[model samples]
Target: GSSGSSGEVQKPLHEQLWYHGAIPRAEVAELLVHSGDFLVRESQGKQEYVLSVLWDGLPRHFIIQSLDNLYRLEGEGFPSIPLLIDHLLSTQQPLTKKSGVVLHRAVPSGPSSG
Candidate 1:
C-alpha cells in the first residue's frame, strides 16, 4: 500500500542543474522587477545571432542547442560564456544588437510560476 501512495514533492528552482549559472538569482530578480517579462527566440539564420546573445552575457549552458543540424553547441566548451554575461550586464538592449532571432513569445507566467 505504501508503494501505491502518492505524495507531493518540492524543490528549489535554482537547485536544478540545468539552470546552473543561467543568470544568478539576484540579477534575475532585478530583471523581473524592471522588465516583468522574459522571452526566448529561435531562428534558422546564421549561428551568429544566437552566438551574439551568448556573447553578451546570457549563460552558455542555457544557450545549448543544435546548430546547422551538423554541429552541436555544447555549453561545457563554450569559451566566451563569461565574457558574454559581462557584455549583457553592461548593455542597454543587448538583444537588439543582433538580428535574425525573432522573439517567439513571452512566458507570461514568469519562471517561478512555471
Candidate 2:
C-alpha cells in the first residue's frame, strides 16, 4: 500500500462541460437557444440522468439509460456519455423515427447565475 501511481482515474460525470448537474426541466429550455442545442442534467429526485435537446423548434428531454455500466438513449449503447455524444454529433442520427431527434451540438455550462 503506497501512494497511487499507475491507476487511471476516470473523469467524474460532473467534470463534463455539457453536464449541468442537478437542474430543473424548465431551466433547461432557457439554456438552449437554438435547435440542436443540448445539455445533460441529473433528474430531479431521481438516480438517472436526462438529455435535454432542442430540435424541430422544440425542447425535448430523453432519459439516458444506465444499464450494466453502459449508456444508451434509444438506438445504440456507449460506454460513456462523451462517447455517446460523439456518436450523435458525428452520425447526426435521429434518436427515434417517431421523435426524429438528433444531437447537433452541446450547450456548454454557462456563467453561474447569482
Candidate 3:
C-alpha cells in the first residue's frame, strides 16, 4: 500500500477496479488533464457511463462498462475503430461541440482509466 498526502495508507486502484470500476484511472486523469475536449455523462444505474470526447474537432462517444472491452456501438458491439463513425451516425444522441467539467486531475496514478 502507498500513503496519500494525508498519510493514509491507500490500496491500489486495480484492487478497487476488481470491485466495480468502469473507467480506467489514467484515461480519466488524462481527460481531465486535457480538460475541455471531453464531456462525461453519468449512468442512471451508476454502472455504465458515457464519455463524449472531441479530438481534431470531431466528436467520439464512448460507452464505458466494466467489461473493459473496446467496441463500436453500432446495431451491435463490434471491436473495430473504423466502424465507430458508422456507429456515431446511427446513434440517436447526436453530439456537437460541447465543453464540460474536468474531473479532479488528482486521479491516482495507480491505474489507467480506459
Candidate 4:
C-alpha cells in the first residue's frame, strides 16, 4: 500500500523484507522498530483498521492453526515466508471486505449495531 499522504508514494513497509532476510536478528529488530510506525499508521488508519485486525489477530490465528504444517516445512528448512505470503494472497478479497465492514461499523454517527 502506498502512503496516504500526498506526494509520498512509498511501498508498503511489510513488502520490504530484504532487511529481515539479509540482516542479523538484532539489526532486524532495530530496523523493524524504527520503520514499523509506517506500517502501524498505514494499516491502522489508512486501510481503516482491516490490516491492523489481520496483523494483530487473524495472522496469529492462522499461524497457530497451521503450526504443525509450518513446523514440518521448517524442519525441512523450506521457506516459511512464502507460505505466509500465499495465505495472505489467497485471503485478500475477503479480508479487504471485512476491513471495509470494520471501518463502516466504526463510523461515529452511524446507527448503532443494536
Q: Which digits, one per residue and each the tens of the lDDT, describe model 4 over residues 1-114?
A: 564453211333344322122222233233222211111112213322112222332221111123443412112211343343334434432323333211111111113321
Error of 3 at 10 (Å): 9.7
Could you tell which candidate, 2 or 4, scores higher by lDDT?
A: 2
TM-score of 4: 0.22
Q: Candidate 2: where is the Cα deviation over 4 Å?
A: 1-11, 111-114
Measured on C-alpha atoms, candidate 4 has an lDDT of 0.25
Residue 74, candidate 3: C-alpha displacement in angstroms:
17
Query: Which candidate should be chosen as best, given lDDT against the real structure?
Result: 2
Candidate 1, 29-98: lDDT as tens digits: 3332223133222224533222212222342213434444422232222223323222343442334323
Per-candidate TM-scores read 0.22, 0.80, 0.26, 0.22
Better of 2 and 4 by TM-score: 2
- Model 3 Cα lDDT, one tens digit per residue, 1-114: 885474111333233222223555345445433423443444455655565455444445556433335543323443433233234434533333253322222223245542
What are the runs in model 4 whose C-alpha is more than 4 Å off?
Answer: 1-19, 34-80, 89-114
State which candidate, 1 or 4, has the greater TM-score: 1
Which ten contiguous residues of candidate 3 have the minimum total lDDT? 100-109
lDDT of each: 0.30, 0.79, 0.39, 0.25
Candidates sorted on lDDT, descending: 2, 3, 1, 4
